Amino acid sequence: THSHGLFKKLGIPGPTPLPFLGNILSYHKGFCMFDMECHKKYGKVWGFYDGQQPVLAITDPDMIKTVLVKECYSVFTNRRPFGPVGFMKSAISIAEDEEWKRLRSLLSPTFTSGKLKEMVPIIAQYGDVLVRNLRREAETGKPVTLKDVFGAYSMDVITSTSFGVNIDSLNNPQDPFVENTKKLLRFDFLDPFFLSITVFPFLIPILEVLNICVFPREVTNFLRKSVKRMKESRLEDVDFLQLMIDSQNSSHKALSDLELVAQSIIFIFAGYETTSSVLSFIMYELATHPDVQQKLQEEIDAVLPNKAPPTYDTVLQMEYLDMVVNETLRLFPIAMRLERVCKKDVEINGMFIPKGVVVMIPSYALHRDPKYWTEPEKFLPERFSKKNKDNIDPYIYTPFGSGPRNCIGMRFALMNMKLALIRVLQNFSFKPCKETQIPLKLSLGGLLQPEKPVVLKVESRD
Amino acid sequence: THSHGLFKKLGIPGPTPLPFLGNILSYHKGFCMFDMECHKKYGKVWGFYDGQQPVLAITDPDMIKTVLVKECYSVFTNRRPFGPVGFMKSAISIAEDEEWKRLRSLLSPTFTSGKLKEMVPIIAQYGDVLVRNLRREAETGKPVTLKDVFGAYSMDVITSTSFGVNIDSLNNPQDPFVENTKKLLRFDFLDPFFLSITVFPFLIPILEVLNICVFPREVTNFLRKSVKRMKESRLEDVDFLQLMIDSQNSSHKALSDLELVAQSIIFIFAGYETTSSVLSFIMYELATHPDVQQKLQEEIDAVLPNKAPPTYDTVLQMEYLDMVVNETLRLFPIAMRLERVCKKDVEINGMFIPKGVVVMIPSYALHRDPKYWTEPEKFLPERFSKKNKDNIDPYIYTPFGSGPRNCIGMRFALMNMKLALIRVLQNFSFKPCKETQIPLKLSLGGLLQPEKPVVLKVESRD
Ligand code: HEM
Numbered sequence: 001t002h003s004h005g006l007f008k009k010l011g012i013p014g015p016t017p018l019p020f021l022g023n024i025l026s027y028h029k030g031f032c033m034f035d036m037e038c039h040k041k042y043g044k045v046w047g048f049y050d051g052q053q054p055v056l057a058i059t060d061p062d063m064i065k066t067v068l069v070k071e072c073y074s075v076f077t078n079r080r081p082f083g084p085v086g087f088m089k090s091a092i093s094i095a096e097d098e099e100w101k102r103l104r105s106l107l108s109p110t111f112t113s114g115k116l117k118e119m120v121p122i123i124a125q126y127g128d129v130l131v132r133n134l135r136r137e138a139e140t141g142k143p144v145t146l147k148d149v150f151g152a153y154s155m156d157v158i159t160s161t162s163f164g165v166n167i168d169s170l171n172n173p174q175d176p177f178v179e180n181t182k183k184l185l186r187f188d189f190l191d192p193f194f195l196s197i198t199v200f201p202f203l204i205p206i207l208e209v210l211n212i213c214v215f216p217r218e219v220t221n222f223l224r225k226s227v228k229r230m231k232e233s234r235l236e237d238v239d240f241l242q243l244m245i246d247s248q249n250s251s252h253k254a255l256s257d258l259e260l261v262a263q264s265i266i267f268i269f270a271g272y273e274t275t276s277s278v279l280s281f282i283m284y285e286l287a288t289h290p291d292v293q294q295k296l297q298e299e300i301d302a303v304l305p306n307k308a309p310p311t312y313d314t315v316l317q318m319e320y321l322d323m324v325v326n327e328t329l330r331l332f333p334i335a336m337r338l339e340r341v342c343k344k345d346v347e348i349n350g351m352f353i354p355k356g357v358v359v360m361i362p363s364y365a366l367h368r369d370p371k372y373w374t375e376p377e378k379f380l381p382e383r384f385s386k387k388n389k390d391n392i393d394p395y396i397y398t399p400f401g402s403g404p405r406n407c408i409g410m411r412f413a414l415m416n417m418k419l420a421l422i423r424v425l426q427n428f429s430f431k432p433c434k435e436t437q438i439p440l441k442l443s444l445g446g447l448l449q450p451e452k453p454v455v456l457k458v459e460s461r462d
Numbered sequence: 463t464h465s466h467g468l469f470k471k472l473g474i475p476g477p478t479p480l481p482f483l484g485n486i487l488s489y490h491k492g493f494c495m496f497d498m499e500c501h502k503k504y505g506k507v508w509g510f511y512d513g514q515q516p517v518l519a520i521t522d523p524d525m526i527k528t529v530l531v532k533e534c535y536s537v538f539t540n541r542r543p544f545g546p547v548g549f550m551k552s553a554i555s556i557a558e559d560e561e562w563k564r565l566r567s568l569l570s571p572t573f574t575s576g577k578l579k580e581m582v583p584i585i586a587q588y589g590d591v592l593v594r595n596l597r598r599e600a601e602t603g604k605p606v607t608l609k610d611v612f613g614a615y616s617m618d619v620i621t622s623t624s625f626g627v628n629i630d631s632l633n634n635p636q637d638p639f640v641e642n643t644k645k646l647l648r649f650d651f652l653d654p655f656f657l658s659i660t661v662f663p664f665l666i667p668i669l670e671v672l673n674i675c676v677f678p679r680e681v682t683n684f685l686r687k688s689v690k691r692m693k694e695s696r697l698e699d700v701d702f703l704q705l706m707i708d709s710q711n712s713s714h715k716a717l718s719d720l721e722l723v724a725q726s727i728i729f730i731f732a733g734y735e736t737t738s739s740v741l742s743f744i745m746y747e748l749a750t751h752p753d754v755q756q757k758l759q760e761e762i763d764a765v766l767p768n769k770a771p772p773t774y775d776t777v778l779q780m781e782y783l784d785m786v787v788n789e790t791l792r793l794f795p796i797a798m799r800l801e802r803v804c805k806k807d808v809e810i811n812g813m814f815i816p817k818g819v820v821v822m823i824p825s826y827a828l829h830r831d832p833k834y835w836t837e838p839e840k841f842l843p844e845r846f847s848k849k850n851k852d853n854i855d856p857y858i859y860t861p862f863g864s865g866p867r868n869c870i871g872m873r874f875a876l877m878n879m880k881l882a883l884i885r886v887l888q889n890f891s892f893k894p895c896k897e898t899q900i901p902l903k904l905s906l907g908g909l910l911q912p913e914k915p916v917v918l919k920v921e922s923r924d
Pocket residue numbers: 092093094104266267270271274275278334335338339398399400401402404405406407408409410412413
């Protein structure tokens with residue numbers, strides 16, 4: 001409890017921590033419910049303890065901008081230390097300081113709009129595959145589980161845009177390349193293991209010396225050798241792998257081979273469950289708000305008549321589609337929180353922050369803050385209309401973070417999801433079932449996902 | 463053994479490491495014998511593994527200067543991570559990066575020649591106490607153990623120059639203030655505990671969370687409350703404590719109370735066994751080289767006739783005394799090694815050094831290098847004569863390190879020891895006994911100290 005007297009000294013409010021545990025027992029109702037209550041009880045800033053680790057929450061847009069943008073390179077550069085990681089220490093999302101600054105520079109040209117526009121035909125091909133699999137489920141009137149049909153789609157886009165492997169994962173759910181990649185599910189930080197890591201972070205170096213890794217050693221080994229097969233088959237005889245292979249064909253020393261494999265794994269880990277989960281949250285709102293679904297289908301047919309195939313330019317042309325995606329990401333920011341480690345004693349916006357404190361931004365609680373959003377629990381896409389989009393603070397609505405360490409795959413993720421929604425809504429309408437959980441209840445765990453899997457009815461428009 | 467392929471990749475020679483242990487089994491004959499053999503077998507640079515920690519040894523004066531001086535603030539700023547330390551993390555010798563740079567700036571005015579000249583009368587007073595205790599042992603013809611009579615003297619100077627406590631520790635060897643401070647003996651890094659820390663450094667955070675500290679918790683607790691008693695007795699109603707108390711009466715935030723206590727402990731830990739051990743090494747050489755002892759006694763009587771009390775200016779006037787002290791420190795550089803942690807990938811003097819490597823300078827092996835010293839094992843004080851002192855490279859002879867992180871108490875240590883030798887040689891002559899180990903054999907452990915305690919005969923000149 002020697003690390004529990006810091007917030008009381010600084011005059012910062014917060015829940016009283018227990019010895020060893022800190023405030024982790026308050027996670028019984030999830031990260032989201034704990035952050036909303038703390039914002040309600042304590043005001044604009046407060047503190048708590050993940051075990052012995054002090055966490056300072058901030059909700060001021062100016063102070064958020066200083067952390068994420070202004071003093072990013074100088075003070076708030078890294079996230080909370082994470083382990084055990086093994087060779088995945090070289091992943092950009094885990095790297096720190098100049099290593100991260102180097103990796104971010106080596107991978108930024110990979111995520112330009114020019115490279116993204118060249119990936120659209122590959123992503124659009126599996127929009128068609130998604131339709132033929134949805135139509136087989138629609139011609140047989142059976143509730144469809146969205147996470148399975150979208151999870152199959154997200155897996156398809158990943159395998160093709162990152163390695164050129166072309167699989168119908170829904171009809172080959174057991175191909176060895178699909179088996180390993182489907183094990184890359186995002187971490188439940190409230191599960192028994194990660195809560196124990198919070199109480200015994202001194203055990204992280206012990207797990208590392210035993211080569212134990214939060215990424216399953218069999219999946220990383222499979223992709224490590226699979227990449228080294230592809231690397232020596234293209235060399236010599238458009239995806240993310242080739243962009244990184246061309247990058248290491250050189251300031252910063254070219255991407256290493258092991259460094260390159262770590263980024264490929266991170267791109268799969270980042271885009272698999274996220275793209276599948278968001279697309280399920282979107283179709284839930286469209287099915288429970290049919291007027292929104294019709295207005296979107298009308299816009300899609302206006303830009304793409306006769307079910308015209310979507311393109312890069314016609315996707316950005318659609319504004320109500322962007323309004324629906326943004327509004328869904330408001331109600332369900334799957335990151336929930338943003339974090340930065342304060343690397344040195346600083347004073348920002350008139351507040352002292354000691355070295356070692358984890359500065360946290362509660363994105364979920366701010367996305368539902370009535371002091372910034374009217375009727376925050378309601379699905380209202382008109383908040384993001386070209387008229388009202390000016391009245392939204394970019395440091396309150398942060399579904400992809402902000403600053404130099406925001407989501408590097410933001411453009412890709414938005415284009416990937418919008419291409420799916422266009423092709424799906426051009427051919428189908430989605431209606432609730434009896435077994436559809438209405439209203440949707442969120443999981444009380446550490447992942448932003450529905451309590452029950454979203455099941456809906458799918459009807460063909462032809 | 464994943465950290466044992468680094469030196470073979472870089473093309474750097476060195477002994478082949480065993481799994482888990484690295485090269486620690488080669489410490490069976492001590493740090494000194496291992497460094498001399500490695501310098502002999504492998505040449506100017508080599509590498510080895512303290513467990514999994516790579517250690518790169520360098521012996522080039524230009525490359526040594528780049529590490530200790532040139533790229534000190536930018537690359538080689540900290541020493542090897544050390545634990546478990548508890549609150550002694552705030553000690554200057556343990557602090558890192560800007561914390562060390564701040565502490566070094568707060569404590570540098572404490573070690574100026576002006577402050578040292580004001581401490582001479584306090585140090586000289588216990589030169590007289592040292593004589594009355596040596597004379598009681600000399601009037602009774604019994605071999606004197608130097609580490610006990612000098613250890614009592616060194617303890618006397620410490621208690622007075624750091625807190626103003628005035629004790630005859632040889633006749634009060636059981637005063638509570640002497641009991642705790644005599645437990646501050648320097649660490650034997652080849653003892654069972656510190657070798658286990660080398661093999662299981664992942665256990666250091668475990669020892670920290672249990673409040674286990676390499677500094678005995680009872681000694682630190684005794685001095686913590688003892689200092690807070692003295693701090694609130696002088697406040698309000700010349701030593702190291704007062705200099706630091708006046709310093710916190712303020713750029714860098716003033717020394718904290720706990721920070722202040724950590725420095726006081728570090729000054730005791732630094733000056734206790736060191737001053738006692740060096741003074742024993744010096745008197746061993748004087749007793750086995752009587753011509754040197756007579757020449758020194760003649761110089762002392764020439765500057766201070768009629769056993770005149772030594773002063774700050776008359777100590778610096780003595781050149782043969784400085785030659786004897788420097789020559790003894792050459793044969794016995796009690797630090798043995800100098801170390802710096804390479805904090806970022808750099809290329810110095812045409813050699814690449816990866817981040818995380820411990821760069822080591824083998825001071826003991828260089829002090830006895832025949833390629834810089836003629837007859838290196840012989841005690842020849844004339845190497846440091848004002849004629850030959852120009853031919854000695856300050857990066858080969860480094861008894862106090864070099865650069866911004868050299869020994870901050872160098873001036874104090876030299877003045878403290880010289881004041882003792884002047885008062886002792888003005889009144890006594892030291893001759894070998896039958897039980898005097900000649901030639902002196904060094905301890906095969908991790909501390910530079912004689913195998914057997916140095917015992918000598920002491921005769922009065924009056
Ligand atoms: C709906 C989908 C996604 C959402 C909502 C999302 C959101 C986020 C958020 C909130 C962060 C943290 C930002 C911060 O800490 O300030 C992040 C980081 C990151 N995201 Fe995503 N992401 C998505 C998909 C993707 C995809 C498809 C990729 C593909 C490469 C990706 C790659 C990354 C990387 C590499 C980082 C770490 C960046 C760094 O540390 O420099 N994400 N994302």
